[PDB]
Subunit: 587 residues, 3 copies
Amino acid sequence: DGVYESTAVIDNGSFGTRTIRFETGRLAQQAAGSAVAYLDDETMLLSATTASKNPKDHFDFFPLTVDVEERMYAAGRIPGSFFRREGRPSTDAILTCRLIDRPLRPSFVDGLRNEIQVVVTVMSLDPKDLYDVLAINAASMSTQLAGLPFSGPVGGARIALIDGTWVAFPTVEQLERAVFDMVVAGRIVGDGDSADVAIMMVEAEATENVVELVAGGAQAPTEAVVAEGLEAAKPFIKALCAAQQELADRAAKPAGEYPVFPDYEADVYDAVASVATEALAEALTIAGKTERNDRTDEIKVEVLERLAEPYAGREKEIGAAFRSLTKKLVRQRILTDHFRIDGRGITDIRALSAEVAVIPRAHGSALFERGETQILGVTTLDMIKMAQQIDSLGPENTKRYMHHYNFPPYSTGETGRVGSPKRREIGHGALAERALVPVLPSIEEFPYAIRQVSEALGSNGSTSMGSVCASTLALLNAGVPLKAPVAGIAMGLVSDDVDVDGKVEKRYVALTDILGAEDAFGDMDFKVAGTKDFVTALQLDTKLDGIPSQVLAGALSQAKDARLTILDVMAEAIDRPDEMSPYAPRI
Amino acid sequence: DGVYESTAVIDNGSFGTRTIRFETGRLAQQAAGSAVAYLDDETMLLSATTASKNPKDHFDFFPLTVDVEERMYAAGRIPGSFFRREGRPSTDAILTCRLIDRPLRPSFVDGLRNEIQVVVTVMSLDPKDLYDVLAINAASMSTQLAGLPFSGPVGGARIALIDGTWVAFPTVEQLERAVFDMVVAGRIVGDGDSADVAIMMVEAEATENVVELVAGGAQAPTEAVVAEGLEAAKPFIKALCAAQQELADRAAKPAGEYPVFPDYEADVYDAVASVATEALAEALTIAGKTERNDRTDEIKVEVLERLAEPYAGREKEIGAAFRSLTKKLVRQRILTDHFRIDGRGITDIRALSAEVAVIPRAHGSALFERGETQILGVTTLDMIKMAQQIDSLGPENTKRYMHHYNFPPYSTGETGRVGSPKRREIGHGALAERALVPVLPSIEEFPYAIRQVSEALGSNGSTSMGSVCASTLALLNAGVPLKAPVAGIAMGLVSDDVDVDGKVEKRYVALTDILGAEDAFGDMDFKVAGTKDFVTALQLDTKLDGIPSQVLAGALSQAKDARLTILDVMAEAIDRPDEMSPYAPRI
Amino acid sequence: DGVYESTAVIDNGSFGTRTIRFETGRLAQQAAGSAVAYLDDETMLLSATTASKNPKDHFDFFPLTVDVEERMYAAGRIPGSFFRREGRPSTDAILTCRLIDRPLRPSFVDGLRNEIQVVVTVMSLDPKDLYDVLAINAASMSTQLAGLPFSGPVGGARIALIDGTWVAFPTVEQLERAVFDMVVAGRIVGDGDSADVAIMMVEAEATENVVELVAGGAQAPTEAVVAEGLEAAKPFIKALCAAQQELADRAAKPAGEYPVFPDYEADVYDAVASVATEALAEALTIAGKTERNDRTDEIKVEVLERLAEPYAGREKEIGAAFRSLTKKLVRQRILTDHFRIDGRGITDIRALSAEVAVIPRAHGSALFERGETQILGVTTLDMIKMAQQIDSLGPENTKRYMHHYNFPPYSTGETGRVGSPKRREIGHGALAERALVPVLPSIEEFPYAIRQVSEALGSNGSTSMGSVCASTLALLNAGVPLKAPVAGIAMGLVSDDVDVDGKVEKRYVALTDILGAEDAFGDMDFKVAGTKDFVTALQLDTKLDGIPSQVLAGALSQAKDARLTILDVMAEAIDRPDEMSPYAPRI
RNA sequence: AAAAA
RNA sequence: AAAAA
RNA sequence: AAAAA
Ligand SMILES: [Mg+2]
Ligand SMILES: [Mg+2]
Ligand SMILES: [Mg+2]
Ligand SMILES: [Mg+2]
Ligand SMILES: [Mg+2]
Ligand SMILES: [Mg+2]
């Protein structure tokens, strides 16, 4: 009676027809919201969102926590541990936690301080399905039901390019003819007539068989093909969002009253603006970097002195308002004068250097530095029996090529805990590993168990693409006969309204090779890695209400040009797979 | 010279004669108290109790911590880990920590805030003895010596029903003819002539051979037999308590001065009583649940307003006194009008529903919900080589049937840490696992390695018995040919003085299927699980100075009636072991 | 261009010639200081020191943290874990962290509160070199560069006694003819003409082949030989310190401004001195221990009352000044009247008792107590297949004899966390294990995998030498045919200026078997363990600017006399290897 | 970490 | 721990 | 660390 259902019928043409079914009202009725998601009546996940009672205001950020529980009775097996129990999250559970957390975290209003928490449990899994793109839907549903200030729903799909057809939610036996495979997550903006979706997250990779299939006669995953993919995942996200909205229009709890804690009030920001606008503006027109820093520090002292004490005991509000003001002014500058915070041009990569044979007695090694970023990659071939043995719900058994990404605390100069990797390091390692598997040689043409270790010896921001380039260098050095070198580049996009003399219109600009500071002044950040001919990895997080096709194509072609320059810089360090190190094993 | 001994001679008639020897003054003379306990001059434990110097008042509870250290040189073996060192506590060490903590925690006075800590180390273990029932004695002794406000000593024994004889402290080769096996822990009340013991803890289970032995001609462990057992463990607890008291009358340190921190003073409680007694009393006479909640909230606002500020800055005392007052009034109501906090009768179980075949692609599964409680059990048969390999001091080698109990944070609606299980979850898993081993089929009639996973999807209190019922359902579903289904029920008992017109006498009442709130209004809480014919598991924690035999027999027969109703509700979901799932292995 | 080098040429005569090369300016340019250290162009470590921005004043101690990262690509191998990743630090990484932390921690000025941190990463390792004595140099260099208040540099070397020649930085194939092997770390004091080094740390052990080699005709590592070793490691420390100083005179960052937080100001200490000097002095002349404690407590009450409130809200300064005053007066007493804090003489060991056959059903066991210290050792022979399998950069494969050292919290009477061992326990276990390997029987004459467990049942200070004696007792008891028993003793040395009637001269005194309190009144603390004929382990931490050869020889001969008395006390408990326990395995 | 498966 | 054984 | 390777 109190169990409500709603289905979304995914229509893949002649490749089949799937049905994702959302059900609520039966299981876990104590959480703030709960929802069970079935994929083809056989895959079954349970998501349950709970919010804390009191807002922990001592925090300075929104404390959302996603957990994915891979129960092993889903696979019909007993865990293989010594204690026959499911222990700590595997790598796939962490990657799915990140997939869920990325489009869900910016969906909550700005200033929420309660401790929201989502826990997606895999209760059944058909051995031919993937569940992460279903975990996104289950989490969005169970958060939409909870009555939180969650501007959803958030529909997520996975599309694969099989024989020129973009198949949505493909099985595992179908992901062996696909050249490209991407997870797209978005939401619907506009009602009735302008209901187009607004993609928020893209995580794309070229399958391990892209080279053989493209040699067979397929179409390689270039940038135009990736744009066709981004435009061919919209109907499915529309279907999923419509189904979630039907269910939550049946059985949603009325919106609770959660207090929001803004960083600064309106009065303080208006005051800082009115009394420092022209000062900060003329502080930005000067062609000097460090001098501009000194002038900004002086303006900081000035706002601290002249606003004391008309606003007594409100120093954090002053600082937050000043940071918002300088961010707005730098954004307007980047939009109008095309000049970035370090005098660089929009299409200028920092100073590149690639060196091979850095570490002695290593099988292969290389040091790739770009600007302040400096990565060291060390490839360690070994016996094929050393391939990592995977034990999880996922379809794969062994991992021949392992990419491990270390981010020591002194990369930025800050002390901290050295030890176990965080979730960021797992995400960066996975992103930089899925960018090299398309070009690795076969297990018959090169029978070893490669293992890559990338060290962020110096960091300014977004070191995963630098790690892709350093991994290509180290892998060519160790003697591994890659099919083609894979470069990488991490760009951003700033979009906003500007007023010419009497017109107020939106304009966009792309920034090549952004720093860590240019990530807070950007409205989209995306990382493209690929060879000379096709993209092997792509990742994109945005919050804009839709990007025109021309702007996306332009930014992606700019990314290709950056990749080609980086590739011509890398091809001077090492052109071909060098000789095996005398310490390397021989098979 | 300063080494004092005292022996307790356990006289098991014709089954032997044991001697537990307590020794102090030689080892670990830096702790607040220390004592070595020998069982038959060969089993040797060392317990050492230490108290912190300053009372950590910021805590809101008594911070006692028990640890049991299973040193492996006791078993004559080197640890088998990769690092050849004893790592984290096994399951048996955790269960023994709980066995010690359960009768020891209520023995300290109310309001102690120092950080007491007990650490029992197993220094030698004969391979034919059990040491947990000896760990209780060692811990009680070493805490009685420390000069703490510890109202001991606490004597603990293990009795087994072998051929109609209740044998105390039986070996492992003797626990194979026993039908029932129970650990009893109690203390002596009354001096000289009325020195009868007052049992505080019972943890009982029917041995894995109960069905075969009862078929042979034994007497099945019914409720009258369990009462005979509770009355046949009194002389041994008397002996152990007398020995500990001899030793601590020889070599105990004078009682130190430890401050106590009451939750509320006498003045505040007297004031709240005098000014809210009749209001809260008439607030309880109304037949409405939610309306009564609103009236109690109104009385809370009233006590907060009219007592402000005659007691300024004393809000916690107000709240604690109000909670004590409402608890006392609800207790008097339950004693007089037989009506509980939710209008239920004393012999009324909540609304039951049992469903099988819930999860798809699972070997067996079932969902059992009772009231707000809702448990999901998933049975996963596999190959016999997957039985858990145990490596510890304990006598068992492998664990064929594994019960794992998960309590997610959203069971109550609260966010929290998802991950490793606490000690409560280990205790509940063990209690619900020892309730099903008496009825599991042999390793020859059903050659698999069963594994059960019980999920507390919805929780109000005491979900372990619900997990026993859900495990019976899931196990019958997966095709496992049980010998008889095993139900469970978690009851309580409220006992107190009441005054009829001119007489003040003690009366008792039993409450069937208590909630989580009816656990703070009860003077005993006990859980009984069993088949149609005999109890397979029992657990009981009390603080009363002895219960008449009639009251205990009545409460236990009431528990049997609850079990029979639950069993007739479960027999409609699934009557017989269903067909094996096509995914299950075939041997 | 910005990459600076400096080499130190170690000249081992006819045994070879090594070259340690320090390089800076290329890798990890974001840390406060960074330096790469090469040993023979093939071993390569990277050290990077970072300091926090703000001084965490809430701490009560200097928060330095050293980490050693053993990257496995150094050894050309993939890690062997299930997850094929380097997990938690091995034992060798912890011992190297301690080797670095011991001479580095007292090098920083007194009162630093920022959170310094050193992280030494092993990027390449020739399989014939050791890297810990190189890690000390890399850490001292990268800390000298950081611009901290670090009074370095600190040069560390390893010398081995091969055929009467003290070889510096010997390989692994050369450490098989050495009888003694010691790590020496020191710094240079005096400039120009009196530039002699001032050793700060010594960690010495006799190689596993000392007995066979001494039988061959070598010179056993007596105390005079160890003194010759301490005098033969000075030129190499001079070379290393000169090289580090050349580099840091090329490319060091100017000293930053770090605030220091003294424990007490000058005014408070001067006041407490002026108003309590004679009171505390006459409080020390009395021959009563406990009475002196009462008088000191009375003087504490007096300084708290009469200095209140001329210094209001300054209680911690009062306490720190009082502790400094009493420490100074006890030091002057020990220097002048030769009387220690407990009336003992300078050459008096506490009351010794050694007992064997303590624990029943153990392969071997013994209890050795000295004063308040009381250690229990339990030897557990087993099958040779149980030897610990090591997987790390280090040269060793298996560990036949394992010494595990447990320090329970109740050793001092304080509650705490029972569980994983700290770094102190690893250091003490290693120190007490390297003291028994010289005398263990071969793998052919006694084919078992011994394992020792030492329990600090009672502790006053420095229980590692007591654990060496208890391990000798337990090992003789279990039937292991040692080549000679190994005793141990932990002495200290107090050195200071004293003024006779008109002369102010430095005098030294040695204290045999110091307590835990006599460690804060001592200017050096060293532990010597050995057999009747030679030292098998030695450890020494000092801060003095050089000790005359006569004083060191005297203190070491005093240590030998203490060892001989302890050995004659141990030889009465058990003279010869007893019979194997009937539970022990037979090979 | 962290110093005593 | 969740964001940067 | 625990109590609920
Ligand atoms: Mg970015
Ligand atoms: Mg991104
Ligand atoms: Mg209960
Ligand atoms: Mg109970
Ligand atoms: Mg010492
Ligand atoms: Mg020392």
